Structures are given as structure tokens and as C-alpha cells.
Amino acid sequence: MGEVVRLTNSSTGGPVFVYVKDGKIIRMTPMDFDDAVDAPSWKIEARGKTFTPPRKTSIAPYTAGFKSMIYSDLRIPYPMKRKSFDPNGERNPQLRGAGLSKQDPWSDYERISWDEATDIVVAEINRIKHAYGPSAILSTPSSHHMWGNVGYRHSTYFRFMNMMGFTYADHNPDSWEGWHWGGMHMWGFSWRLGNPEQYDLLEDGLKHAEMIVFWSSDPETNSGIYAGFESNIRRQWLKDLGVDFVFIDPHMNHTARLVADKWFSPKIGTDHALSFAIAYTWLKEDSYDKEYVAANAHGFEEWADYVLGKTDGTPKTCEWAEEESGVPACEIRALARQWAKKNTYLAAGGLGGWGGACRASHGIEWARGMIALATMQGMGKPGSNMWSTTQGVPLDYEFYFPGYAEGGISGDCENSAAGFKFAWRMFDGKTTFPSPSNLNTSAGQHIPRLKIPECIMGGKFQWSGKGFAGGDISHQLHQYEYPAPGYSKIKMFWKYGGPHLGTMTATNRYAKMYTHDSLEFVVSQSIWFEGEVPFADIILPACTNFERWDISEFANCSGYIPDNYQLCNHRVISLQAKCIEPVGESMSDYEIYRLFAKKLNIEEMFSEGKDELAWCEQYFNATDMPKYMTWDEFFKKGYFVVPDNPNRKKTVALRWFAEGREKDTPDWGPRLNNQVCRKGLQTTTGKVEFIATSLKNFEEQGYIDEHRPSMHTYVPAWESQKHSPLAVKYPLGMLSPHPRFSMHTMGDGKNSYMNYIKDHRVEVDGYKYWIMRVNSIDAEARGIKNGDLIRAYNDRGSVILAAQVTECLQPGTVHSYESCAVYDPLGTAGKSADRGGCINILTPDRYISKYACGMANNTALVEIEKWDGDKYEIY
Amino acid sequence: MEQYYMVIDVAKCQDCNNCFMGCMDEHELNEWPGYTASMQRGHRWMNIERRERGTYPRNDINYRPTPCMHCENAPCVAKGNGAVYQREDGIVLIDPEKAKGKKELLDTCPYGVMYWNEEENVAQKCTMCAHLLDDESWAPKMPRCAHNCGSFVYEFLKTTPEAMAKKVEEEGLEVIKPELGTKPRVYYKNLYRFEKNYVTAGILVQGDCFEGAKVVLKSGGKEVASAETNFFGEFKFDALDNGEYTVEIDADGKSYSDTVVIDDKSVDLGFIKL
Ligand SMILES: Nc1nc2c(c(=O)[nH]1)N[C@H]1C(S)=C(S)[C@@H](COP(=O)(O)OP(=O)(O)OC[C@H]3O[C@@H](n4cnc5c(=O)[nH]c(N)nc54)[C@H](O)[C@@H]3O)O[C@H]1N2
Ligand SMILES: Nc1nc2c(c(=O)[nH]1)N[C@H]1C(S)=C(S)[C@@H](COP(=O)(O)OP(=O)(O)OC[C@H]3O[C@@H](n4cnc5c(=O)[nH]c(N)nc54)[C@H](O)[C@@H]3O)O[C@H]1N2
Ligand code: SF4
Ligand code: SF4
Ligand code: SF4
Ligand SMILES: [Ca+2]
Ligand SMILES: [Ca+2]
Ligand SMILES: [Mo+4]
């Protein structure tokens, strides 16, 4: 009926140009810059060359095929109601997921209007509040959300929920685990949940790098986060400069498969054995920065004695490490000597921190081991630092534009990074106001996301820390209980999405909690009918960001990751145009909340009379954008490439710390009161503490925790092959990192195009099965061949997978990505084998340590065999 | 009469599948009158081949994105009975309507790039988004794969046969199944990664990795390759044709030598303790 129009929008996989015609999306593509209106790119001269990025953006796989998710047939059609659910009669809690238990989820629901769906939900809210109170209403979205700042969970969700309830199931620091619960005590960086600063490292690396050690790092796959393939050319440059790339990862990951000069496959949970043997070598050969350490380390003398085996009678030799990890002694020693004599950067994780190794049972020692190595080599000095090659791009750190983590329209200073700068800019205390929460706070009531099942089915729990404990090193040490004093047990559960079966730990328990009679009501506000959604009583259809207006910046998260847009080659700010009308009877989360506000008699206070677009303009004017172009002009253009700032003086990460001077980078910390004349790290001594003073106080106060000693030591992983009694029955070591062709659950299932990718899922007799990589020697020993359906199992459950026999795993180790979007039980829900591919049904739910309340997923012992077709309803 | 050509660098494929997700985005929910009816889920106009070589721990893997070869001497054009035609720019296209009801078309392909669409009852395959190349409005002026890449694998160009031939020789470009004589206009760079094999090992002197050892590869008795071991004591001779070879190693005056058989498989000699 009309012509094609090029619009703009973005995603978690990068910004895109969207072509529309007659209300239909025709295609989505990477973005090309128009040099007539888009500012020039930065340039870096190093080792005789000139390095400048391509005048173009890049996208991730899951974004390239995103159109198939938007128009998915698993896309929730309209509000739905569980047939067996009667608000005023038999609620039949025990029938939640009944359809799923008979392999027909859809038949459990019937269609209802929006007016009725909300009428029902409102009646439950008001009943529960007046009888038990706002705390009786549990709710939680999850870690990731559809791209869009104004509509991100930190913004729209919090702004509405803070006005209605509620008990928040605060999120465990999943991505940071090890750095958060362990590394933090060693070097601070709480405002980054234990991760390191990365500013201006690209130019420093190009000028000085000779070697880079990628440890639990796969940049090509993870891109750090949200950055498509922006850094791919940077490693190309380093490669062509003669820099050696070494990979240490149980699985020969994708970055390694592309540019590895050497690959090591340590057994799961044994990395810290390698780092101890590397430090041992440095000590025996005097091959480390002694001067650096004398000035910046604390308790090094004692730590040194342990590494040498004086205090425990076991020198941490390369041979000792070989027997632990399977990695050849000579190669560990060779790497150590090369590392010492070369300008080596430690790429721990794919962001500069993180790394699957941190959320494993050895996650705490690995993170501290990483800090140890980097420290001994003098991080901060030219050609020596912790850098994963994904951040450090010379972008304009001075230009300010909010990340989603800064709260958007909620202004929640307690649960978003709004308190740092954006809150002050967005609200004026006159015409527009924030939405605080007097419950989602420490003295209020929240529960750990990782232990929701025990709280609902058990009615009680006690733990350490509240969600992201980034305020200070010791905030995570504070003790909480459930129910919180004076507050009520959970009666209702308002879910935003439903991915926990594939994303948490020992997930069968999450399927079981839904039928507990304590749960009076379960609402589900999601986009696709999958995962946990088929357990709800009421289902509300939410739309993707391509069906609403918003605004954002390429990969800009901010908050606990200050200035992370440095992951990109450019700072691209784009208007996320509403390209098409909401699909089916779905609506945006903000319009859903606006309808409830009207019903709860708080419409004015919640919306302030604004639609999503009006909030966008207000958001716009609270940034630095106006300095370059008005709202109108920006709306018209669709995107803006931030100009380069050639002059600003460079401040390399941690260099100020290496040189014993005041902190000069744009980092959000440490806070003044955590430093003596703003020098040194956030730790007490201002030094890297090998014997953490925070933990030493904790343990002397009575909190004894054997798996989290004050001194970084070799604590055997409690879920490893040689230290767990469990290995007798389950001899195979499993690690389950993030999905290659999906942003966690957003990409997999849903009948998307990604399901046809050879290395993503395998079709066998009409059904596309999840993949588990097995080493040829282990497969042969079990009669397993490529493409065979196998059963992965242990005491937690059974998962049906298609086998991929490969060499990219040391014999004895198996690999399978996590974040499966499809939960499809062969028998009763939560009690039988899954064939959807939820590998997390098999991961350990035990906290990393007694007081380290994080997930230890990447260290899981399992056993495999050809599947005899049984449903194994024994859980 | 300038023609279209596509160059793929195997050493650069990382198998992220942006290409493939590229056709699907362009062809699964869309119809392009004159070029092709919507694509059938499951087809791989863009097929990325995967091949692992060697054995743990000195193994490796390489990928080969395989769209339609659009060869100069297209067999299915010669045997398609008018159901397939070659344009002046070199693009080989299946006539969406004339090809309907003919399963046999598929067998005329030496490469196996066409797929049968059940619902449409017609063979389908790579069109090199001719529908996009023919439109000025499409600024990129290149197929969806190439434009979707984030690894700089593709080099899409429109030039003369003289220019392309010169380039083929300067970069050593090659084609799949050259012996068939169809003359594909899709060339591969570093194709040896995918089609050939290697022999590797690690040299140790007195318990430690020995760097700088001199290694020589021989066939028939004459040197075919030489190299010095890196700091891990390893060497690697790739792009090897099937056959028997002799590896001679010299370190610290200490000599070692052994034979190796290459039969469509790469070999890892393990640790050589000198
Ligand atoms: N395609 C895609 N990209 C993503 C995501 C996604 O879901 N899909 N997730 C995004 C998010 S939330 C984040 S937080 C970042 C995280 O970035 P990372 O934490 O780096 O992501 P992981 O996928 O866990 O990558 C860990 C890498 O470490 C290896 N590894 C795992 N356990 C161990 C271990 O014990 N020892 C060693 N030596 N190596 C180990 C794995 O094989 C894997 O390749 O990724 C982001 N990028
Ligand atoms: N074995 C193992 N397990 C791991 C890890 C590992 O390395 N190994 N990684 C851990 C880490 S870092 C993380 S970050 C977690 C992933 O943690 P997540 O919470 O588990 O998983 P996501 O897939 O991002 O789920 C987000 C949900 O939000 C919904 N959603 C998104 N946008 C919108 C929207 O606009 N509206 C509505 N209504 N819903 C929306 C989606 O449909 C989806 O169900 O996995 C963790 N688990
Ligand atoms: S998009 Fe590029 S790197 Fe990705 S699979 Fe295709 S050719 Fe390979
Ligand atoms: S690759 Fe096949 S379909 Fe394409 S032109 Fe050559 S023979 Fe015909
Ligand atoms: S040119 Fe178009 S049809 Fe041909 S492989 Fe590339 S994306 Fe597919
Ligand atoms: Ca060094
Ligand atoms: Ca490769
Ligand atoms: Mo994460």
C-alpha cells in the first residue's frame, strides 16, 4: 500500500536499521555511517601504524534473526487464564503446570480480555495488601531485558512496582560471583561488583602488548556484553602486530578456534591450581615486579610462604598443578616464564573481569588468583595490566548519556545507579518526581533470587547480602532472614518473564514451587509462551522493543559497569522507533502498568500524564545530547554518532594505583572516605590484600567459612572430579557457559531462525535438541556417536541432548551451553527428564561458600549415556 | 559487461552464522517477485561447512561458508531447460515459475546448493540477493551475508574478468571442485585450512619446552617446509597433501626424525623428549 522506509531501533545485540513497508518489518541490518553527517572516528598510532575503526556498526547472531522472534508463533497472543483457576472458588494450586506435565501447555489456558485480566489481578492485589500487606506480593523480572532505556526493568518496572507492592526477589550477582564475593575483599572495586577499571587500554595494548592470556575468556562470543562483534578487528590488529594469544578454557572456545596460538584445557574447578603454579615459578625464579609488590601488596610475605609450601607442606609446583588439572607441567612453566619476560595482558573473562570461571565452585579463588598474577606483574604499568581487549576504546568519556542501569524514569536510588548522576538530572523536585521503595531496601524485605523455591516451599531462610552488594566491600556480609521481622510470607507472585528453569541452579526446584499451596496467585507478564509462563494463573502479553518507542546507546549499561560503551568502536545513540504496531493483543510494559495504575487509582502519580514518547523527550533533555541537537532534530535523524575527543589526556586503567598517586580516571570510585587523600584502592590498607582484612574481621567475629578463607589459598573445588565423592557416580566434569547464538533465553526456542544453526540445536526425528559437546574418547567408551540422543544426569535430574563428538575438550570434560528457553518435561513437571535442553537442571545449587551466596554453576559433575527413551520420572 | 564476484577468507570464519541469519531475514517472511518465493525453514542457501582436524590437544577447526557458486559454466543452466538462466553480470537464477513442479532440477548441481521447497513445489537457492543488487535504494550494494559479517570474511566486488583473474593470482584464490570445470565466481582464500592437513608436535629438552629448535618437513627426500619451535616447543606444517612425510628435528645438537602418514587427517606427534 506504500513505500519502504528505513527506521532505527536497537537490541542487546547492537543497533540496527529497520526497513518497514505497510506496517510490516521487511529486514534488519547493521548500521552504516553517512560521513556527511556522522562525526569522524578516533585514530590510534602505535608501533608504526595507524589504527582507525570501520565506519560501521556490527550485530550479534540473535539480533540478525530477531525478526523471527518478534513474529513468533510462541509469542503470547492475548491475556490468558488458567482454566483450573477460580479466584472465588477452587484455585487448584496443585494444577499449575498440569498441561506441561501432559506435554500440552497451551491447553491449560483460555482467552480473556485485558479488562478482565487486570480486574482479576487488581482484586488479588487489594485483597492481599489489606490482609497481609505489600510484602505478601513477591515479584521479580530477571537479569536481562529487551533493549530500551526508558522501558528497562530498572525504569518502568521499578517505577510501577515501587508504587504497588512489594517483596523483591533481588538478583544474585550472577555475572560477577567470584569477583563479587571474593575478589572484592582483595582489591575493592565494589562499585563494579569486583571487576576492574578498563579505561584507555586499547592504545596502551597496541603500543605495548607482546602477549595476551585469555583466561575463561571468549570475546567473540560474549563481546564483553551487548557489543555485537565490535572488537573483532582490534584482535586482528594485535595479531598482525605479532602479539601471541594463549587460551586457558576447558572448552576450545570460539575466540580460541579463530586466533589461538596455544590452548590449555584445565579440568573444571582447577584453574587456581595453574595460577598457583605460575606464581610459584615466578617466586622461585625472581621473575616478578618485586618493587611493585613491596609498595602495593599486603600479606604477600605470608601468601608467598604458602605458595612455596612452607606452611602446608606442599610446594605449588607445575607438576602438582598438572596432576590437578590435566594440563602438562612443562607448558605451565613455559607460559609462566614467557609471561614474566613479556609485556603480557591478562584477559580474565571476556569483559575485563567476569568469565564463566567466576561462577563456579572455585570461582572465589580463581578471581583472586587472577588478581594475584596481574599484581605480581605490576598491573597499571605500560604493557602490563588486566585487559580482555574488549573495552579500552578511546571514546569520549567526558560526554554523558545514561545507561539503562541508571534507573530511567523510576529514579530508584536504592536499586538503580540513579543516585550517581541521572536522578539529579531527570527530576527537578517541582514537576516530575521519582518512585521510591520503602520495602525493597535492607531494613525492608527481599529474598534471594537463587533461593526463591526454598522460601515459598519452606517458608523460611537466612542468608548474606542483598542482591548486588556494591556499596562497600562488607555490605555483602550483612545478614538477612525471611520472613523479615514484622513482614509477611509470600502469598502472591508477579513474574516478569520466566527463564529460571534454564538460567538458575538445580532448576527442577523452580518447577516444584509453583504447586505449593502457600502460593495463592501467580501472574506472568511476558512476551513468549515458554519456560515458566505455563505455570501462571494469569498471563499478560508484553511486546518487544520494536513495537514501542524508546531510546538508548549502543551497549550502554553503566551503573555497576561505568562507561561500558567503551566496548564499541563508536558511541552510537539511537531513537528506538516504534516500527510496527504491537503484535496480536500484546502491549508495552508501560501501557500495561498505566492501565493498572488507573485501576489502582494512581494513574496520575505513575504516568504524570506522559506516554512513553513524552518520557523519552524528558529523558533526552536530561543528557548531554541537547548540546549537539534538539529532540526534534534527533527524532528525525534516528541516531547520533558521538564526536571523537582527540585532546583529552589519557588515563590508563589502574596506572594511578601502580604509580602510587591519586586516582585520575572517570571511574565511579573508590569513594573519598574509602581512600587516604584519594590514593590507593578501596581496601583498608589501600593495597591489594592477599590476606583480606575484611574477611579476617568477618571470621574473627565468628563467621567461620572454610570455603572462603581470608588468605587466597588453594581450596579444592567442592564440585570437581578429584575432590567430590559425587565423581564416583558422575565422573564427567561439566561447564555450561553462555549460549553462542542467543542472548541467554532471548534467541533460543520461540521457533526462531537461530534454531536452524548447526552448532545451536540438532533436529532428530522432527525435534530440535540442545547440544552437549563430548570428547571422542569419552563418547567411544560409551558407544556414543555424533548426533546420538544422550541423557545427561546426576542426583538433580535428567536432560536429553544431541551429542557432538569433538576434540575441543580434554577427555573427561563435557560442555553444554546454558540459558535454554525451552522447558519441555517428558513426564510430570519438575520430576522428570527434560528434552527442551535445560542443562541447569543439573547444576549445583549449593552456595559457592557458606557466606558467599552466589551461583557455582560452571562446576557440575554428571554422567552421560545413550538415551533408552525412558522419561525418568524419579525426581 | 562488468560481473559480480565474491571472495571468502576461510581463516577468518568464526561460524557466528550472521550470514545465514541474513538470508532468513531477507527470504523467509518475504517474497521477491521475479527472483524467488519465500524461503523454506531448514534450507541453507548459505551453508557453512564445519571441519575439525587433529586430536586433543593439538587440534583445530575451520569453517567454509558456501553460498551458490554461480559458476560461469553452470551445469543446471545447461540442463535446466530454461528453468535456470545466467544473467550478463554472472548471476545464475532459477525462474520461480518455470521451475515449479520440477524436483529433478536439484540433481543438476555438482555442488548441491539448491533446496526443494515443499509448499511452493520448486527448487530454490542462492540468488545473491539479485533483487537487492538491482535496487539503487539499497546503499550497501552487496548481499546480506557479506553485509552481516562482523569478521571481515567477505569481499564482494563487481569488475572485469581481467581484474578478477589478476586478483586470483596475487592472493592465490581457489574454488571448490576446480576439476569439474564450472568456473565458480565465488573464490576462497586460505582454503587449505579447510581442505588440507597438518602435522604438529611439541619438543622437550630435559623436561622443558625447547624454543628455537629447527624442524624440517620432507617428502620423497627433499625439504618441503622448515620452521623453528615457539616458546611452547611446537611447530606446525599445514597445507599438506595426502602422502608420506619425514620430520627431522635438530635441537642443542641433538637429532630426531620420524615418518608421518597424511590421509585426509592431521597428525599430532605429541611430546618429543630430547
Ligand atoms: N552470545 C551471547 N553473548 C553473551 C551472553 C549470552 O547469553 N550470549 N551473555 C552476556 C552476559 S550477561 C555476560 S554477564 C557476559 C559474560 O562474559 P563471560 O563471563 O566471559 O561469559 P561466559 O559465556 O561464561 O564465558 C566464559 C568462557 O569461559 C570458559 N569457562 C567457563 N568456566 C571456566 C572455568 O572454570 N575455567 C576456565 N579456564 N574457563 C572457563 C567458557 O568455556 C567460556 O567460553 O557475556 C555476554 N555475552
Ligand atoms: N550453568 C550456568 N548458568 C548460568 C550462567 C553460566 O555461566 N553457567 N550465567 C548466569 C548469568 S551471568 C546470568 S546473567 C543468568 C541469565 O539470567 P536471566 O534472568 O536468567 O535470563 P534471561 O534469558 O535474560 O531472561 C530474561 C527474561 O526477561 C523477559 N523479558 C525480556 N525483555 C522483556 C520485556 O520487555 N518485557 C517482559 N514482560 N519480559 C521481558 C524474557 O522473555 C526472559 O524470560 O544466567 C546465569 N546462569
Ligand atoms: S558472518 Fe562472517 S564469521 Fe559469521 S559465519 Fe558467516 S562468514 Fe563466518
Ligand atoms: S553452484 Fe550450482 S546452482 Fe549455482 S550456478 Fe553452479 S551448478 Fe548452478
Ligand atoms: S547473497 Fe543473499 S542469497 Fe546468496 S548466500 Fe548471500 S545472503 Fe544468501
Ligand atoms: Ca611480564
Ligand atoms: Ca579457524
Ligand atoms: Mo550475566
In angstroms, what separates the C-alpha of A463 from chain B's closest C-alpha? 41
Kindly state if the Cβ of A13 falls inside 6 Å of ligand 2: no
Answer yes or no: A446 catalytic. Answer: no
In order, the DSSP letters of A811-841 are TTEEE---------BSSSTTTS-BSS--GGG
Residue spans of beta strands (DSSP E) within B78-168: 84-86, 92-94, 115-117, 122-124, 154-159
Residues A368/A182, Cβ–Cβ less than 8 Å: yes
Are B56 and A741 a contacting pair at CB < 8 A? Answer: no
Residues B64/B193, Cβ–Cβ less than 8 Å: no
Residues A274/A266, Cβ–Cβ less than 8 Å: yes
Residues A585/A77, Cβ–Cβ less than 8 Å: yes
Are A64 and B231 a contacting pair at CB < 8 A? Answer: no
Q: Does A301 touch chain B (CB under 8 A)?
A: no
To the question of whether residue A107 is assigned a binding role by annotation, the answer is: no
Residue B249 domain boundaries: 197-273
Element spanning B258, H or E: strand B254-262
Answer yes or no: A174 catalytic. Answer: yes
**CA end-to-end distance (rounded Å), chain B:** 62
What is the Cα–Cα distance from B189 to B125, expressed in whole angstroms?
Answer: 23
Q: Are residues B33 and B50 in the same domain?
A: yes
**CA end-to-end distance (rounded Å), chain A:** 56
Q: Which of B27, B39, B53, B231 would you mutate first to test chain A, the one with the most A CBs within 10 A?
A: B231
CA A105 distance to own-chain centroid: 29
Of A789, A804, A800, A845, give the one whose Cα is nearest residue A825: A800
Q: Are residues B218 and B205 in the same domain?
A: yes
Q: Which of B21, B59, B200 would you mutate first to test chain A, the one with the most A CBs within 10 A?
A: B21
Q: Are residues B100 and B149 in the same domain?
A: yes
Residues A347/A213, Cβ–Cβ less than 8 Å: yes
* Cell, residue A262: 596455544
Strands A767-775 and A761-764: antiparallel
In this structure, the number of other CB atoms found within 10 A of the CB of residue B101 comes to 11
The last residue of a domain, from among B193, B211, B241: B193
CA B80 distance to own-chain centroid: 26
Strands A767-775 and A797-806: parallel
Q: Which region, left, alpha or beta, applies to residue B82 given φ > 0 means left and ψ of -120 to 50 means alpha? A: left
User: Which phi and psi (to 5°) does residue A451 adopt?
Assistant: -130, 25
What is the Cα–Cα distance from A318 to A296, expressed in whole angstroms?
Answer: 27
Are B230 and A261 a contacting pair at CB < 8 A? Answer: yes
Query: Which residues of chain A are within 8 Å of residue B20 when distances are taken between CB atoms?
Result: 756-757
In the Cβ-directed half-sphere of A50, how many Cα atoms lie within 13 Å?
4
In angstroms, what separates the C-alpha of A263 from chain B's closest C-alpha? 8
Q: Which region, left, alpha or beta, applies to residue A39 given φ > 0 means left and ψ of -120 to 50 means alpha? A: beta
Q: Is the dihedral of CA B27, B30, B31, B37 positive or negative?
A: positive
What is the Cα–Cα distance from A777 to A775, expressed in whole angstroms?
Answer: 6
**B125 CA to middle of ligand 4, Å?**
9
The SS3 of residue B135 is coil
What is the Cα–Cα distance from A687 to A679, expressed in whole angstroms?
Answer: 10
* Cell, residue B232: 611452547
* Cell, residue A308: 612455596
Which residue minimizes the CA distance to atom 17 of ligand 2? A143
The SS3 of residue A424 is helix
Q: Are residues B38 and B86 in the same domain?
A: yes
Hunting for cell 584519594 — which residue is that?
A678
Omega cis (within 30) before A160: no
* Cell, residue A293: 609488590
The SS3 of residue B29 is coil
User: Which phi and psi (to 5°) does residue A658 adopt?
Assistant: -65, -40
Amino acid identity at A839: I
* Cell, residue B128: 545473491
In angstroms, what separates the C-alpha of A29 from chain B's closest C-alpha? 7
Which residues are CB-neighbours of B50 under 8 A, at least 6 positions away?
A758, A759, B15, B61, B63
Q: Are residues B188 and B201 in the same domain?
A: no
CATH code (residue B220): 2.60.40.10
Kindly state if the Cβ of A496 falls inside 6 Å of ligand 2: yes
What is the Cα–Cα distance from A385 to A393, expressed in whole angstroms?
Answer: 15
Residues A257/B52, Cβ–Cβ less than 8 Å: no
Kindly state if the Cβ of A507 falls inside 6 Å of ligand 2: no
Among chain B residues, the shortest Cα distance to A804 is held by B52
The last residue of a domain, from among B193, B210, B225: B193
Which residues are CB-neighbours of A530 under 8 A, at least 6 positions away?
A74, A498, A745, A749, A750, A821, A822, A823
**A36 CA to middle of ligand 5, Å?**
30
* Cell, residue A154: 530498572
Which residues are CB-neighbours of A721 under 8 A, at least 6 positions away?
A267, A268, A269, A727, A731, A733, A812, A861
Kindly name the residue from A38, A62, A108, A144 that is annotated as catalytic: A144
Residue B38 per-residue DSSP state: P
The SS3 of residue A243 is coil
Query: Which residues of chain B are within 8 Å of residue A333 when distances are taken between CB atoms?
Result: 208-209
Kindly name the residue from A157, A168, A226, A404 that is annotated as catalytic: A404
The SS3 of residue A31 is coil
Are A330 and B204 a contacting pair at CB < 8 A? Answer: yes
**B145 CA to middle of ligand 3, Å?**
8
Of A556, A670, A549, give the one whose Cα is nearest residue A624: A556
Strands A244-248 and A262-264: parallel
What is the Cα–Cα distance from A228 to A568, expressed in whole angstroms?
Answer: 9
In this structure, the number of other CB atoms found within 10 A of the CB of residue A437 comes to 22
* Cell, residue B176: 571448490
**B87 CA to middle of ligand 4, Å?**
13
Which residues are CB-neighbours of A410 under 8 A, at least 6 positions away?
A154, A155, A156, A157, A158, A159, A162, A416, A418, A434, A435
| Domain A5-72 listed as CATH 1.10.260.40 | no
What is the Cα–Cα distance from A360 to A358, expressed in whole angstroms?
Answer: 6
Residues A189/A181, Cβ–Cβ less than 8 Å: no
Give span(s): CATH 2.40.40.20, chain A.
725-866
The experimental technique used to determine this model is X-ray
Of A647, A242, A205, A241, give the one whose Cα is nearest residue A382: A205
Please name every residue paired with A7 in a beta bridge, in sequence order, or none if there are none.
Answer: A18
CA A580 distance to own-chain centroid: 29
Q: Are residues B120 and B235 in the same domain?
A: no
User: Which phi and psi (to 5°) does residue A687 adopt?
Assistant: -115, 175
Q: Are residues B51 and B27 in the same domain?
A: yes
Report the topology of domain A725-866: Barwin-like endoglucanases (2.40.40)
What is the Cα–Cα distance from B141 to A472, expressed in whole angstroms?
Answer: 53
- What's the structural domain count of chain B? 2
Q: Are residues B32 and B127 in the same domain?
A: yes
Hunting for cell 516530575 — which residue is that?
A432
Distances in Å between the Cα of A567 and the Cα atoms of A147, A236, A381, A390, B44 are: 16, 16, 22, 5, 32
Q: Does A32 touch chain B (CB under 8 A)?
A: yes
A601-634: buried (b, 16+ CB within 10 Å) or exposed (e) per residue?
Answer: eebeebbeebebbebbbbbbebbebeeeeebeeb
Q: Are residues B136 and B22 in the same domain?
A: yes
DSSP tally for chain B: helices H, then strands E = 6, 17
What is the Cα–Cα distance from A373 to A409, expressed in whole angstroms?
Answer: 42
Please name every residue paired with A386 in a beta bridge, in sequence order, or none if there are none.
Answer: A346
Report the topology of domain A177-394+651-700: Dimethylsulfoxide Reductase; domain 2 (3.40.228)
Amino acid identity at A533: V
* Cell, residue A372: 594475584
CATH code (residue B50): 3.30.70.20
A667-689: buried (b, 16+ CB within 10 Å) or exposed (e) per residue?
Answer: bbbbeeebbeeeebbbbbebbbb
Q: Are residues B209 and B177 in the same domain?
A: no
| Domain A80-174+403-547 listed as CATH 3.40.50.300 | no
Q: Are residues B156 and B265 in the same domain?
A: no
Q: Are residues B67 and B177 in the same domain?
A: yes
Give span(s): CATH 3.40.50.740, chain A.
80-174+403-547
Q: Is the dihedral of CA A318, A321, A323, A326 positive or negative?
A: negative
Answer yes or no: A312 catalytic. Answer: no
Give span(s): CATH 2.20.25.340, chain A.
5-72
Strands A761-764 and A80-82: unpaired
DSSP tally for chain A: helices H, then strands E = 28, 31
Among chain A residues, the shortest Cα distance to B59 is held by A807
In order, the DSSP letters of A328-341 are -HHHHHHHHHHHHH
Q: Which residues line ligand 4 (CB under 6 A)?
A: B 68-71, 74-76, 92, 109-111, 113-114, 125, 182
What is the Cα–Cα distance from A265 to A252, expressed in whole angstroms?
Answer: 7
Residues A258/A808, Cβ–Cβ less than 8 Å: no
Please, which contacts does A47-52 make with residues 24 or more away whose CB atoms are closer than 8 Å?
A47/A206, A47/A207, A47/A241, A49/A237, A49/A241, A51/A206, A51/A237
Query: Which residues of chain B are within 8 Å of residue A568 when distances are taken between CB atoms?
Result: none
What is the Cα–Cα distance from B165 to B5, expressed in whole angstroms?
Answer: 11
In the Cβ-directed half-sphere of A763, how many Cα atoms lie within 13 Å?
11
In this structure, the number of other CB atoms found within 10 A of the CB of residue A82 comes to 23
Q: Where are the alpha helices (DSSP H) in A483-582?
A: 500-503, 508-512
